[PDB]
């Protein structure tokens, strides 16, 4: 199919669709089987039983009335939510506002920290852009939520697969679509500071708790999060409140009051969030991708994206087992 350069020409041959309606045509398709496309926009695909999660700074162009407003010139009055700014946009700042916290650079005590793989380069496998049309199968599907990565020990397999003789079929090819990078060994320390001004005590307490989580959990950083790289932990050493007095008890009580006011004794979402931050150090836990189109004879696992959508997941239910953290799809053969 040679696509038309632009617009509709008087004489183009395409396929149309007509219903009763008001005797009009609603869509244009080049061939009999093609992209059906979607009416409506992703902005209003959020569930109806959830508070407004759209950005506090919005875009009017959800309809093409962006033109009527723009020509009218009233563009600074139809932006922002009628209620105001969320806690995240207030603390970190938006385009019109300014953030009240600043993060500095992190340095090392010595000039040369230890590097993994004895200083050699690591040949990572192919990484491709996520496809949004997997958790949203049908035209009536809703947005599942934010995406988070789990912790594991899969970097050992990547390192072992690299630094291997090219004769072995298990080696990683040095194609143009790959990328070779360096890494820093574990247990290497970096030091930095965070500067803040004009913060309420509950904001300060929440920020301190976010920076310093419980010892069980850890944060994630850097390239190749899906492969297990970048699990880091941040420690808080001292708070400089200046001339004004400050005690940790008031910070804890204020954070408790704010969290109680916000969540109002709801624990499902928080439990799911805290399950995703668990640091799994077991070397016997394997996480991979289904590897679409399972082939060959024998069991060869039950994986495969097309195969997985036929028996246990199904289009109606794939908005489930994905919002439940730490769930597997297939057993070890």
């Amino acid at each position: 199919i040679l696509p038309k350069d632009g617009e509709l020409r008087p004489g183009d041959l395409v396929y149309f669709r007509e219903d009763k309606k008001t005797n009009t045509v609603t869509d244009i398709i080049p061939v009999r089987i093609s992209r059906t496309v979607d009416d409506e926009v992703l902005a209003r695909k959020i569930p109806d039983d959830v508070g407004d999660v759209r950005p506090c700074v919005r875009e009017i162009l959800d309809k093409e009335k962006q033109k009527e407003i723009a020509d009218a010139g009233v563009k600074e009055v139809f932006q922002h939510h009628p209620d105001g700014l969320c806690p995240a946009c207030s603390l970190f700042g938006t385009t019109f506002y300014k953030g009240r916290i600043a993060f500095g650079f992190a340095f090392h005590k010595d000039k040369d920290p230890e590097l993994a793989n004895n200083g050699k380069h690591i040949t990572l496998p192919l990484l491709e852009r996520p496809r949004p049309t997997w958790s949203m199968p049908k035209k009536e599907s809703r947005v599942p939520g934010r995406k988070f990565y789990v912790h594991h020990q899969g970097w050992e397999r990547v390192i072992k697969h690299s630094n291997l003789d090219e004769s072995d079929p298990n080696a990683t090819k040095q194609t143009v679509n790959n990328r070779s990078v360096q890494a820093i060994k574990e247990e290497q320390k970096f030091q930095f500071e965070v500067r803040f001004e004009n913060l309420r005590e509950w904001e300060l307490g929440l920020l301190v708790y976010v920076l310093q989580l419980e010892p069980q959990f850890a944060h994630k950083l850097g390239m190749g999060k899906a492969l297990g790289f970048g699990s880091v932990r941040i420690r808080v050493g001292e708070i400089h409140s200046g001339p004004k007095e400050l005690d940790e008890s008031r910070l804890v009580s204020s954070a408790m009051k704010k969290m109680e006011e916000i969540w109002d004794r709801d624990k499902n979402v928080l439990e799911k969030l805290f399950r995703l931050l668990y640091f799994n150090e077991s070397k016997d836990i394997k996480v991979r991708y289904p590897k679409l189109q399972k082939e060959k004879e024998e069991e060869e696992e039950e994986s495969g994206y097309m195969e997985l959508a036929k028996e246990e997941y199904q289009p109606e239910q794939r908005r489930n087992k994905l919002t439940n953290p730490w769930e597997g799809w297939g057993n070890i053969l």
């Binding site: 008087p10 902005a43 209620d83 700014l85 600043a102 993060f103 939520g145």
Partner: protein
């Protein structure tokens, strides 16, 4: 008229693409092109997405009248204009196209600029004939003095040129040479002599009788020649200024100004001719010359931002007597017909009476420094989205610096925050802020010079991206670029500058200035932009504290809120998904009035605290942070992020992780979200009707709404081969 039509056409293309927010930027960019010269012109290109394929620039690759490339359309228009009109050059074409586009912007794009501009002017011209006989006198000239000299600009200057009907431009001769008018020199000289003699003369325009008095008695016998730039004729540079909003910390609605500024090092010849009945120079003239030789006074317009400082060098003079040396004088006609042969040297030893005080300031920066130059970023072939400001010196190469306007703004903001005077009305106020810096109906008592970086600074490429919250990864191809100057705690950046204050300033203002300078040195205010990302931090020594051992102030949120936490147990015989999705909450708490920025502490509803937090980061698993440079052509090898061979972690990554976890906890909105996107999906071949699409075809060149139906048939021209039936019967019998 051709320029107006071209401007209108260009304004149409931008409007059509939906890019009306860059018309003023292009209006300044065309004058930057004027300065940049045409012979070696090479406009930038795209960001080179994918592996090696360049992309399309967001301004230079706009389709205009079927000419996709603006870079060639502009050249073709210039060639056509040069062919049509004689005595035509690149500079005039660019100037005409610039003003025209500025007019189109002011016309079609409102709210992009400020305008209470006309106040306290009104032109006045008075004349009056005498009513009484003036009389007769008996004192006349008996001596003549010719004084040589040169004026060298040690700081960029600015002389305003304005007509009744590029708002402001530096005045220059029709041949391009920079010009220093004699009116400015006479005014400066009379102001200095009035300061020396402590007078308050105004000259009252035309009065009944001549004013007399020493100020009008000495300028009546002084002749000054007009001067021109001896070694400089190039077009000047453009400087930009903004006005911030103290409450929000951002620019105002229409705060943006432009002003052409001359270079540094232009030599202006000096000529003075004094004819009076005295055998020695007046003391006031010698005092003024002593003041000028040290460069302690300002000569140009924008003196509030430290501009127009000139130094006088190579002073020499000769005295002529018209009573006995008339022939010697008439031989050279006073030194204007023929240059004088023998010159005598003048001492003019010293003077320490000038009313300004110079204090040097040195500030060391311990982080990368960046300042944005949007107009210059569109003419550099390197293609970077942001680049640092540079100037030119006629003595010696680009010099990186921080403009003195930014330093003045920082000082004013610091003083206002300290004394809570950033919101009070300043009409008839006379407070500390209205005294140090002045208000509209007053002037200032401080002159702030530019801060020149000392050493050999180096630039670096820094990359940034926006990671969507729904699907992890870049929300668009739009990578961001910058060229900061590399700075580390061990290898700091040193800034040097001069601040001039008036001798008549009271002690309280001096103490306030000292406190503001102390706060600046301590590091309450970063230099340049991107201050929240760790760029340009003063007094930053994160390694002073000997690391953080264990943790202090530890509490568990899950235990206090009775979270089950679903401890559970993992199984070895299952393969888990690498990523999951977190369901949204129910309640989002929004507020209308965030805390202000103009007050250091104002507890209208709750207490506020300000300080800093010391942290430490360690890696449980190997970490990968790529650099901006690669070694290879096909398989690009990467190295770890470093600042001149020193490994470090940018603050943007930590900001992003902390922010994302923050929306995870507090159930805030999705700050980065591609809300303008529609999915496609596919139609299944069969499925209560599986398919119901009718067959129709587009009609002739009638109204586009009409469309005629059709019936589907079969067609040939997609086959394999044509032959007799024997070949068809032989097609089989392969095997099986």
């Amino acid at each position: 008229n051709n320029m107006l039509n071209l401007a209108g056409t260009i304004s149409e293309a931008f409007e059509r693409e939906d890019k009306l927010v860059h018309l003023r930027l292009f209006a300044d960019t065309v004058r930057e092109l004027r300065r940049s010269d045409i012979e070696t012109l090479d406009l930038p290109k795209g960001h080179a997405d994918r592996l090696g394929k360049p992309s399309d620039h967001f301004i230079w690759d706009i389709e205009i009248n079927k000419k996709v490339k603006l870079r060639n359309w502009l050249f073709w228009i210039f060639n056509e204009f040069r062919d049509t009109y004689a005595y035509f050059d690149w500079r005039t074409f660019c100037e005409a196209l610039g003003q025209a586009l500025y007019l189109e912007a002011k016309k079609q794009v409102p709210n992009q600029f400020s305008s209470e501009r006309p106040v306290g002017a009104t032109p006045a011209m008075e004349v009056k004939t005498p009513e009484h006989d003036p009389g007769r006198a008996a004192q006349g000239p008996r001596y003549e003095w010719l004084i040589k000299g040169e004026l060298v600009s040690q700081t960029p200057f600015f002389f305003g040129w304005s007509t009744e009907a590029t708002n402001l431009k530096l005045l220059a001769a029709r041949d391009g040479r920079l010009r220093l008018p004699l009116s400015v020199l006479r005014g400066i000289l009379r102001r200095d002599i009035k300061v020396v003699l402590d007078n308050k003369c105004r000259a009252e325009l035309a009065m009944k009788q001549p004013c007399s008095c020493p100020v009008c008695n000495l300028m009546k016998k002084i002749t000054i020649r007009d001067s021109f730039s001896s070694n400089y004729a190039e077009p000047p540079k453009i400087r930009h200024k903004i006005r911030l909003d103290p409450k929000s910390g951002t620019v105002a609605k229409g705060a943006l100004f432009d002003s052409e500024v001359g270079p540094r090092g232009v030599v202006f010849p000096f000529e003075l001719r004094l004819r009076s009945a005295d055998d020695t120079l007046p003391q006031a003239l010698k005092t003024v010359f002593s003041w000028w030789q040290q460069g302690t006074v300002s000569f140009s317009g924008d003196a509030g931002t430290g501009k127009g400082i000139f130094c006088l060098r190579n002073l020499k003079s000769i005295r002529w007597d018209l009573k006995t040396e008339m022939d010697k004088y008439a031989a050279t006609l006073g030194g204007r017909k023929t240059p004088v042969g023998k010159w005598d040297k003048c001492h003019i030893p010293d003077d320490k009476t000038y009313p300004w005080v110079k204090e040097t300031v040195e500030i060391s920066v311990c982080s990368p420094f960046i300042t944005k130059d949007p107009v210059n970023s569109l003419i550099d072939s390197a293609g970077y989205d942001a680049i640092c400001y540079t100037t030119v010196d006629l003595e010696k190469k680009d010099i990186y610096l921080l403009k003195g306007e930014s330093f003045r703004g920082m000082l004013r903001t610091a003083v206002g925050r300290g004394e809570n005077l950033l919101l009070r009305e300043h009409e008839d106020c006379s407070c500390t802020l209205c005294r140090i810096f002045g208000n509209e109906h007053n002037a200032g008592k401080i002159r702030v010079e530019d801060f020149i970086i000392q050493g050999e600074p180096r630039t670096k490429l820094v990359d940034r991206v926006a990671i969507d919250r729904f699907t992890a990864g870049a929300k668009d191809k739009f990578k961001f670029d910058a060229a900061p100057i590399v700075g580390t705690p061990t290898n700091k950046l040193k800034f040097r500058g001069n601040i001039w204050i008036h001798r008549d300033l009271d002690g309280l203002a001096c103490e306030s200035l000292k406190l503001a300078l102390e706060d600046i040195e301590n590091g309450l205010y970063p230099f340049g932009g991107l201050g929240n990302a760790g760029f340009g931090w003063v007094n930053y020594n994160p390694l002073s504290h000997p690391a953080q051992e264990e943790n202090k102030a530890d509490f568990s949120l899950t235990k206090k809120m009775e979270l089950n936490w679903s401890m559970k147990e993992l199984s070895t015989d299952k393969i888990y998904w690498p990523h999951y999705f977190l369901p949204f909450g129910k309640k989002v708490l929004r507020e209308k009035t965030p805390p202000s920025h103009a007050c250091i502490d104002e507890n209208e509803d709750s207490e506020l605290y300000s300080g800093k937090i010391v942290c430490t980061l360690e890696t449980r698993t190997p970490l990968i942070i790529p650099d901006s440079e690669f070694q290879g052509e096909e398989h690009k090898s990467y190295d770890f992020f470093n600042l001149n061979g020193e490994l470090c972690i940018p603050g943007s990554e930590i900001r992003g992780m902390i922010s994302s976890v923050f929306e995870a906890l507090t159930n805030s909105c999705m700050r980065i979200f591609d809300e303008k996107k529609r999915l496609s999906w596919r139609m299944n071949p069969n499925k209560n009707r599986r398919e119901l699409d009718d067959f129709i075809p587009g009609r002739v060149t009638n109204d586009r709404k009409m469309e005629e139906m059709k019936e589907y048939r079969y067609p040939f021209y997609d086959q394999a081969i044509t032959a007799n039936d024997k070949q068809n019967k032989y097609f089989d019998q392969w095997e099986a």
